[PDB]
C-alpha cells in the first residue's frame, strides 16, 4: 500500500516563481465587496490610454523662436533608454521588462499664443552612420509637415523597424537590437507673431503614449542604480 | 498545493522482489522480430512432455539375469530427494522450489534382445515400518504385472497419497510430509533366452516424467552444496 | 489524510536521461512565429537525400589512366569505420550511434573529358579469406559493368548481408558483426582518348548516400579521440 516514490535531486530547494501555491492556514475568510472605480488589470492598457510628457532638457517641451531654421529643435534616439523619454510612464513601466515591441505615439501640442504661428517638419530617421544636421537632409526620410494654425496638436507615430521581433529595453553601446534610429523635429519656419516684442517664442509640449501594437515581455529585477 | 505525505518506516529499504519496475533511462528501443522455434513459457510443461533416465547405481537402468526371483531389482523412496531420481530433469527442476504436488510417471523400457523375455511386478508401497523384502510381501499392494513380449515398454504412475496438499521437495529424517513410500520392481520370472551363453541378462531403462497433476510452488534460493 | 509513501532506494540520484521534465519557473512565454525554410526532423532523412564525396587517398575520386587493367582502382572494406568513408556525412552521422542496418548507395561520376572513354567493373565482394587482387577473380561476385559513354554517372548499391539484424558502427579486429566485405572498382578497359597527350587520365568522383533501408540506432557518447 505505501506508494513507491523517487525524490528528484532538486528536492528540498526554493525556486521563487514556482507555478503553485503554499498550504493555507487561515481558511474561510469572506472578503467585503470592493466596489471602488478605476481598477486596471494590465499595465499595457494604462500605458496605451495615457500620455506623459517628455523631458527635453528638463522641461516638458521644446521652443521655437523668431530665429530658427535648419538645425533640429528636438532630437532623441529611438530607444526606451533615451534621455527625453526619462520621466515618462512608458519608459518607467519598461524598466520592469527586458524586451519591447511596437510603436510609440508622440503628440506635440503648440502652446504659443493664438496670435502666433510656425510650421514644423517631424522626421523618423532610421539607423545610420550619423544623424542629419539640417532639415534638407532629413526630409528625404519619413516625415510630416505640421502647420500649426491648421491643428494646434499633431500626432506622429515612430514605427517599429527591425529584423528582430523585439528589441531591448536596456540599451548600451549600439547593437542591432539596441537602437531603432532617431526622432527629430525641425522648424520649417520660425515663429511669426503679431508683435515680436510681446511673443517672441512659443513652446511645443511633447507627450508619448504606447502605440496600438506596443508590448512588453520578460519581467526583470532592478539592477544597481545608475 | 503541496500534498501531505507520510513516510512509512520501511522507507528507504531494498526489498528484492517488489512487484514493480525501476525507472527507464534508455527509451524507445524496438527489438528485432524473434522468429526462432521452441519457445517455452513454463517449466512444468517441459517437465511433463519430456522424460529423463534415472540413476540406478550410476547407470540409467536395472538388470534382470537368468537367476533372479524374490528380491527387489529396483527400489527408490518416493521423494524428489531420492537417489535414483538424481540426474533427472524433474528432480533437478524441483530444487528451485520448496513444495510439490502430484504424480510421477515412470516408464520402463526393456532393451534385452528380441530372443529374450522376462516378467516384472512393479509395486507402489505406502509409508510403513520398513519396506518389503520379497515380492510375495509387496504384491499385497498396488501393483502391475509387466509381461515383456506383450509390450516392451511399460508405464506406471506413482500416485500422490498424503493428508497434506503438498509435500516437501527437500527431504530429511522422515516426517509426515517428507516421504510418500517406495517404488519397487521385482522379477516375476528370471530372464529366459534362446541361448543363455549369448544372452544371459537384459537391461530395463527407467525414465521419469512429471505426471498430469504434478506441480511445483514456492521458488527457493540454493543452500550450501551437499 | 497524509498519504503513505515508501521511498525507493535509488531515491535522491541523478539519472541523466529520465523521460520527464523539470519544474518550470518562467511561465507563459509565447514565442515568435518561426517561418524559415529547410527544417529537418530526422537525421536519417538528410543522410538519405544527400550525398558526400569519399576520401580516396585524400581526394574525392580515383583515376583511370591509359595504362590500367587488372588491379583494383578503388577498394574499401564495408564498414562505416572504413577510411574512404571518412569525410562523409553518413560516416560522420554514424559516430553518434552504436549500430546500423541497411545499404549504402555509391555513385560514381566520370569527369574525364567528352573526348575520353573507359569501362569499369564494380564488385561487391563478401567476407572472405582475403580480397581479390585481379578482376577476373572478383568478377565471380556480384558486379556491374559500367560503360562510360552510355551514362557518365553510375549508381551501385552495397547490400546488407549478415546473420545479425544490425552491425557495428565502430569496427575493430574482424568480428562477425564488424565488417560486411569489400567494395572494389576495376578498369575493364584503360582510358582511351582522342589524343593521349591532351587527355591521359580521367577522374571518377565517388559519392555515398544512405540507402533506402538504412538506419541507425543506439545513441552513444564520444570516446577518446584516435
Amino acid at each position: 500500500a505505501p506508494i513507491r516514490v523517487v525524490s528528484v535531486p532538486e528536492s528540498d530547494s526554493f525556486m521563487s516563481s514556482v507555478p503553485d501555491n503554499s498550504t493555507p492556514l487561515y481558511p474561510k475568510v469572506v472578503v467585503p465587496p470592493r466596489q471602488v472605480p478605476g481598477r486596471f488589470t494590465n499595465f499595457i492598457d494604462v500605458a496605451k490610454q495615457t500620455y506623459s510628457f517628455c523631458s527635453i532638457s528638463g522641461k516638458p517641451y521644446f521652443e521655437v523662436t523668431n530665429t530658427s531654421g535648419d538645425e533640429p529643435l528636438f532630437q532623441m534616439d529611438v530607444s526606451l533608454s533615451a534621455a527625453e523619454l526619462h520621466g515618462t510612464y512608458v519608459a518607467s513601466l519598461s524598466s520592469f521588462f527586458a524586451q519591447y515591441r511596437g510603436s510609440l505615439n508622440f503628440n506635440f501640442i503648440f502652446t504659443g499664443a493664438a496670435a502666433t504661428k510656425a510650421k514644423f517638419l517631424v522626421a523618423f530617421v532610421p539607423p545610420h552612420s550619423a544623424a542629419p544636421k539640417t532639415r534638407d537632409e532629413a526630409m528625404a526620410c519619413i516625415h510630416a509637415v505640421w502647420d500649426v494654425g491648421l491643428n494646434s496638436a499633431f500626432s506622429f507615430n515612430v514605427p517599429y523597424s527591425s529584423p528582430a521581433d523585439f528589441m531591448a529595453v536596456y540599451s548600451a553601446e549600439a547593437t542591432v537590437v539596441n537602437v531603432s534610429g532617431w526622432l527629430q523635429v525641425y522648424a520649417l519656419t520660425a515663429l511669426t507673431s503679431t508683435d515680436i516684442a510681446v511673443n517672441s517664442k512659443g513652446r511645443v509640449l511633447v507627450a508619448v503614449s504606447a502605440g496600438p501594437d506596443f508590448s512588453l515581455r520578460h519581467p526583470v529585477d532592478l539592477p544597481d542604480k545608475q | 498545493a503541496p500534498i501531505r505525505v507520510v513516510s512509512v518506516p520501511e522507507s528507504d529499504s531494498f526489498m528484492s522482489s517488489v512487484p514493480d519496475n525501476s525507472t527507464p533511462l534508455y527509451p524507445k528501443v524496438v527489438v528485432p522480430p524473434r522468429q526462432v522455434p521452441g519457445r517455452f513459457t513454463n517449466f512444468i510443461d517441459v517437465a511433463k512432455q519430456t522424460y529423463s533416465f534415472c540413476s540406478i547405481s550410476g547407470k540409467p537402468y536395472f538388470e534382470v539375469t537368468n537367476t533372479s526371483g524374490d528380491e527387489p531389482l529396483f527400489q527408490m523412496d518416493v521423494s524428489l530427494s531420492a537417489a535414483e531420481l538424481h540426474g533427472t530433469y524433474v528432480a533437478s527442476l524441483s530444487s528451485f522450489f520448496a513444495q510439490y504436488r502430484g504424480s510421477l510417471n515412470f516408464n520402463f523400457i526393456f532393451t534385452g534382445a528380441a530372443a529374450t523375455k522376462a516378467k516384472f511386478l512393479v509395486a507402489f508401497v505406502p509409508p510403513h515400518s520398513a519396506a518389503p523384502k520379497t515380492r510375495d510381501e509387496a504384491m499385497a499392494c498396488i501393483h502391475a504385472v509387466w509381461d515383456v513380449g506383450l509390450n516392451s515398454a511399460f508405464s506406471f504412475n506413482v500416485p500422490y497419497s498424503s493428508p497434506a496438499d503438498f509435500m516437501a521437495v527437500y527431504s530429511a529424517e522422515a516426517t509426515v510430509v517428507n516421504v510418500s513410500g517406495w517404488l519397487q520392481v521385482y522379477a516375476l520370472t528370471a530372464l529366459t533366452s534362446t541361448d543363455i551363453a549369448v544372452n544371459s541378462k537384459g537391461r530395463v531403462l527407467v525414465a521419469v516424467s512429471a505426471g498430469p497433476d504434478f506441480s511445483l510452488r514456492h521458488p527457493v534460493d540454493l543452500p550450501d552444496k551437499q | 489524510a497524509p498519504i503513505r509513501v515508501v521511498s525507493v532506494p535509488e531515491s535522491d540520484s541523478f539519472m541523466s536521461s529520465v523521460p520527464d521534465n523539470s519544474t518550470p519557473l518562467y511561465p507563459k512565454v509565447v514565442v515568435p512565429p518561426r517561418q524559415v525554410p529547410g527544417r529537418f526532423t530526422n537525421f536519417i532523412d538528410v543522410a538519405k537525400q544527400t550525398y558526400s564525396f569519399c576520401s580516396i587517398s585524400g581526394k574525392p575520386y580515383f583515376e583511370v589512366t591509359n595504362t590500367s587493367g587488372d588491379e583494383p582502382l578503388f577498394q574499401m572494406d564495408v564498414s562505416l569505420s572504413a577510411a574512404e568513408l571518412h569525410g562523409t556525412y553518413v560516416a560522420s552521422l554514424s559516430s553518434f550511434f552504436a549500430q546500423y542496418r541497411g545499404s549504402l548507395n555509391f555513385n560514381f561520376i566520370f569527369t574525364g573529358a567528352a573526348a575520353t572513354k573507359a569501362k569499369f567493373l564494380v564488385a561487391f565482394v563478401p567476407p572472405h579469406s582475403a580480397a581479390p587482387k585481379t578482376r577476373d577473380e572478383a568478377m565471380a561476385c556480384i558486379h556491374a559493368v559500367w560503360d562510360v559513354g552510355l551514362n557518365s554517372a553510375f549508381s551501385f548499391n552495397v547490400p546488407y548481408s549478415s546473420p545479425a539484424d544490425f552491425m557495428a558502427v565502430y569496427s575493430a579486429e574482424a568480428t562477425v558483426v564488424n565488417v560486411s566485405g569489400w567494395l572494389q572498382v576495376y578498369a575493364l578497359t584503360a582510358l582511351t582518348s582522342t589524343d593521349i597527350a591532351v587527355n591521359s587520365k580521367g577522374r571518377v568522383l565517388v559519392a555515398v548516400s544512405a540507402g533506402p533501408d538504412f538506419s541507425l540506432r543506439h545513441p552513444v557518447d564520444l570516446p577518446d579521440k584516435q
Partner: peptide
C-alpha cells in the same frame, strides 16, 4: 495569473483563498 499545476486545487477554493462577496 501564475498558478499552473493541476494540483493548484488540492485544497478547496474557500480554504486556499479568500472569497469575494
Amino acid at each position: 495569473g501564475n498558478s499552473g499545476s493541476i494540483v493548484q486545487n488540492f485544497y478547496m477554493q474557500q480554504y486556499q483563498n479568500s472569497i469575494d462577496a
